[PDB]
Each structure stands twice: as structure tokens, then as C-alpha cells.
Amino acid sequence: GPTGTGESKRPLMVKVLDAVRGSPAINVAVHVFRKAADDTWEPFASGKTSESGELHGLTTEEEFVEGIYKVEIDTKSYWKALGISPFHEHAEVVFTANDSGPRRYTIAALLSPYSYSTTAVVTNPKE
Amino acid sequence: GPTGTGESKRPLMVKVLDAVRGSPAINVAVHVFRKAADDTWEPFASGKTSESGELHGLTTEEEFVEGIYKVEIDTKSYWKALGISPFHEHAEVVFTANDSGPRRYTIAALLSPYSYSTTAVVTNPKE
Amino acid sequence: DSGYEVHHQKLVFFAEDVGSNKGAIIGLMVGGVVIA
């Protein structure tokens, strides 16, 4: 379908708040991290989001093979552009999904300088 | 479970000796003190024990939130009822616990007028 | 080596146990009537 950039699977469209700015995630430079079995994460690529925290088209939408991948609102590379020191390049936390079918919520992270939780306006199961 | 007063966690049941009376802690008026990081302790509430040093039901057993709290055989308020001058309203001593799991020994203090160590008939790890 | 050398504390230096289970076998014994 939409090669390169598109919103078939609804990858990212939400309203965000900031911990220290109180605003949506404005132009977040993105480093994508992947959860391993020994809990540590490795960077994938680079980008810069929208004002509302939205970044799309890092690779082709369907040619990108599925896996442990993310559209992360990364504290390490975004807050470097503001000159303040971050701590969470990634966070060794557990996450569980897909017991009886996939839904649509992607990890739009909390913009805090040293850390991140996940910040998004939550949506119901909807196709 | 036992609201107000009860012995689910075994808070206090032991045989005591006295330093100056040679007897169990008879009707000890209790001031509960809490260890801080700068080693000093503050009073909590008031009561009066049994003949064997047992006082229960200062607050509700489960509604009382856990923390640095105590059933202290206090020298300051008990020995005031006998008219002799105490010195240890509390004692700035270190205490260590809970390396790999909690056990049951609560601080039943030595009845001495000016001071207190901890006096109790010791029990084995038992559920 | 790995980070689970914390479980090398959980050798000889460990003794505690509490548990509650056996709800699925209840359904498997409610399901003891029909399995074919």
C-alpha cells in the first residue's frame, strides 16, 4: 500500500504532554531501541518527529520486516538537541502483549530529560 | 482480619525480665519512637502494657501503614509513673534487618530507669 | 557471566516459600467429564 510513509496500521497519531515542557513532543529526534532477553536495548536509526511527536517513514512500511521495533520518543537524542543531560537512552522494563490478538498502541514515550514513561491519549479497541 | 487488636503477625508475646525489678514489664506506659537518618527519634503515641510487657491496639492492625514503627518498652514514660528519673527517651543505636526476608522479633526493651537494651525470650524462625 | 549472579546469592543462602495454585486442574476436572 503506502510505500515509505503511510498510516494503514495506524503507527502514530496521538496527543502528547511533556514532563518538563507541558507540551506535545515537539520535533523529537528519535533513536529506536529493541528489547532483548538480557533486558538491554540497542539503537536502530535516526529521525525527528513532528510537533505532536509523530515520526514516520524511517523505512518502507511493508518492506520493513516485523519484530521488536518501535517509534520511540527517545530522551537521549532529543534532549541532546536542547543541551541538557539525559539518562534513559533506554529503560530495562518489561512489557507484555498479544495474548489473543493484536491491538493498536505504540510506545510514545514520556518526554522527561533523564527518563521516560509512555505518554499517549488512549484509544479503545477499534478497527 | 483482626481489626483494632489481634495477633496475626505475632506483634508481641514474650517473657520479660527487669533490670531493677527482676520481673516482667508490668504495665509499661509506652512511647513509640521512630529511627531517622540523623539517628534521632520522635514520639508517636501513648498506652500502657500488660504485666508481661504486652500492649496492642494502638491503631488498627492492618489500617496502620507499615514503616519505621515499634512497640517500645519506653523508659521515659513508664518510669515517670514510678517517680524516678529516666534518661533514654530513645537511644541512637543502629539496627539491621531484612536481607533476604522478614522474621518475627519486635523490640521489647530492657526496663532500666535511665536506659534500655532489648529484652525478650528468643524464638526460632517459625511460621 | 550474566546479571543473574544475584541468583548465586540464591544458593545455600536462601530458605523461604509461600504459594497457592491448582485452579486450572479444577477446570481440568470440571473438564474431567468430556475430553474427546
From Swiss-Prot, chains A, B:
Main location: secreted
Record note on what altering residue 69 to H does: In AMYLD1; leptomeningeal amyloidosis; vitreous amyloid in some patients
Outcome of substituting residue 50 to I: In AMYLD1; amyloid cardiomyopathy
Modified residues (Phosphoserine): 52
Phenotype for residue 59 to K: In AMYLD1; amyloid cardiomyopathy
Gene Ontology BP annotations: negative regulation of glomerular filtration; phototransduction, visible light; purine nucleobase metabolic process; retinoid metabolic process
Residues that bear 4-carboxyglutamate: 42
Subunit relationships: Homotetramer. Dimer of dimers. In the homotetramer, subunits assemble around a central channel that can accommodate two ligand molecules. Interacts with RBP4.
Name used for this protein in its record: Transthyretin
From Swiss-Prot, chain C:
Residues carrying covalently attached carbohydrate according to the record: 4
Consequence of changing residue 36 to V: In one chronic schizophrenia patient; uncertain significance
Domain of life: Eukaryota
Stated name of the protein: Amyloid-beta protein 42
UniProt region (Interaction with PSEN1), positions on chain: 18-36
Binding site for Zn(2+) 2: 4, 7-8
Function: More effective reductant than amyloid-beta protein 40. May activate mononuclear phagocytes in the brain and elicit inflammatory responses.
Effect in UniProt of substituting residue 29 to V: No free radical production. No hippocampal neuron toxicity
Consequence of substituting residue 16 to Q: In CAA-APP; Dutch type
Site positions for Implicated in free radical propagation: 27
Binding-site residues for Cu(2+) 2, renumbered to this chain: 4, 7-8
Residues flagged as site, Cleavage: 1-2, 10-11, 13-14, 34-35
Cell location: Cell surface
Susceptible to oxidation, annotated site positions: 29
Subunit structure: Interacts with FPR2.
